[PDB]
Design a protein around this ligand. Structure first.
Ligand SMILES: Nc1ncnc2c1ncn2[C@@H]1C[C@H](O)[C@@H](COP(=O)(O)OP(=O)(O)[C@H](F)P(=O)(O)O)O1
Ligand SMILES: [Cl-]
Ligand SMILES: [Cl-]
Ligand SMILES: [Cl-]
Ligand SMILES: [Mg+2]
Ligand code: NA
Ligand code: NA
Ligand code: NA
Length: 326
DNA sequence: CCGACTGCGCATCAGC
DNA sequence: GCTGATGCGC
DNA sequence: GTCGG
């Protein structure tokens, strides 16, 4: 892709600031720059050219200037050789280890993959399962495997109740030829903004998926969000599929369109769209879009009958899921 | 210059 | 137990 | 780190 060198660098800078510096605005700034440059349809040739895009200011401009001259960036290379930074960054790759636990583990001298296995008694549950499948969760999921995962989920969801609708979101819905995990939006018509006419609604689905041995592990669960692990079944003599992260969100059925807009993303598109919502004086979440009053108070939920209606309110031309991969 | 930066579910911890 | 703040991940 | 007012 066209500016891979530059965006890779900004992403490594973003990760450093989040994981090591715990500077979450620099992280979000670097990611925004990495995003707007990733879609810029020319091969960048100077820092000043890039400064024209919003989100690239002066600091990033000079870094682009150095990178284009030398092919590298001294800030990054010094960071790659600071053993502490290098080790915090690595620990945050285990699901459930963020910048704080990663640094906490440094101070105790727990630093390699082996150190983690040696010390499983120091991990909470999520961190334990993340260590268990560390290598699997690094692998991406070919869309062909996603189609099989979708057929299992949707067919097993129907066998619990045929009134459930389950929609696969994430990069899958955006047309990606591969995905990092599997995001499932769930609706059932006895769970609306007005009433929870049935308990266990998400449990029943998770239970069925464990009974057929599709869902293999649980990172976290509550009445509307499930995050865990699943595995496709394999054939005789055939190697096993990698284990895969799976998330299931139960959203009130009358709030489907805000939920599917949320869960389709991308995360940076969502962040860009909600930012623009605020410029137009609205606030969007995964349930509602509401006006902000003269006092900044969120008002009452506007009516939404399509994904497009949400775009209409904030005066954006509608964007198809495939064009939301920011 | 400088306030503001998207929004939220679940796990965990502190303090009561 | 609850509440509110924080970590973490989406 | 960036930027709109
Ligand atoms: N910080 C955030 N703010 C707002 N929305 C956010 C968000 N983080 C994740 N979301 C998202 C949108 C995403 O598509 C959806 C699922 O989030 P996810 O982490 O699975 O990202 P995807 O978009 O599916 C990736 F492309 P991949 O899974 O293929 O690697 O919820
Ligand atoms: Cl910051
Ligand atoms: Cl809706
Ligand atoms: Cl709401
Ligand atoms: Mg995903
Ligand atoms: Na700019
Ligand atoms: Na992690
Ligand atoms: Na996910």
């Amino acid at each position: 892709t066209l500016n891979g060198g530059i965006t890779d660098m900004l992403t490594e800078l973003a990760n450093f600031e989040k994981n090591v510096s715990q500077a979450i605005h620099k992280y979000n700034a670097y990611r925004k720059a990495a995003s707007v440059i990733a879609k810029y349809p020319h091969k960048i040739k100077s820092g000043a050219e890039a400064k024209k895009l919003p989100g690239v200011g002066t600091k990033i401009a000079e870094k682009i200037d150095e990178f284009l001259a030398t092919g590298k960036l001294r800030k990054l290379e010094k960071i790659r050789q600071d053993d502490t930074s290098s080790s915090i960054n690595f620990l945050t790759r285990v699901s459930g280890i963020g910048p704080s636990a990663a640094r906490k583990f440094v101070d105790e001298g727990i630093k390699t993959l082996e150190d983690l296995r040696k010390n499983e008694d120091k991990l909470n549950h999520h961190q334990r399962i993340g260590l268990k499948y560390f290598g699997d969760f690094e692998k991406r999921i070919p869309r062909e495997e996603m189609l099989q995962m979708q057929d299992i989920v949707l067919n097993e969801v129907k066998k619990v109740d045929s009134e459930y609708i389950a929609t696969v979101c994430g990069s899958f819905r955006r047309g990606a030829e591969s995905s990092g995990d599997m995001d499932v939006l769930l609706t059932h018509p006895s769970f609306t903004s007005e009433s929870t006419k049935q308990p266990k609604l998400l449990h029943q689905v998770v239970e069925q998926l464990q009974k057929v041995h599709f869902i293999t592990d649980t990172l976290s669960k509550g009445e509307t969000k499930f995050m865990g692990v699943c595995q496709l079944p394999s054939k005789n003599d055939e190697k096993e599929y990698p284990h895969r992260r799976i998330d299931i969100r139960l959203i009130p059925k009358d709030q489907y369109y805000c939920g599917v807009l949320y869960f389709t993303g991308s995360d940076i598109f969502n962040k860009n769209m909600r930012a623009h919502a605020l410029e137009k004086g609205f606030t969007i979440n995964e349930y509602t879009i509401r006006p902000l009053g003269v006092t900044g108070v969120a008002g009452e939920p506007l009516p939404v009958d399509s994904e497009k209606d949400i775009f209409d309110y904030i005066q954006w031309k509608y964007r198809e899921p495939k064009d939301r991969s920011e």
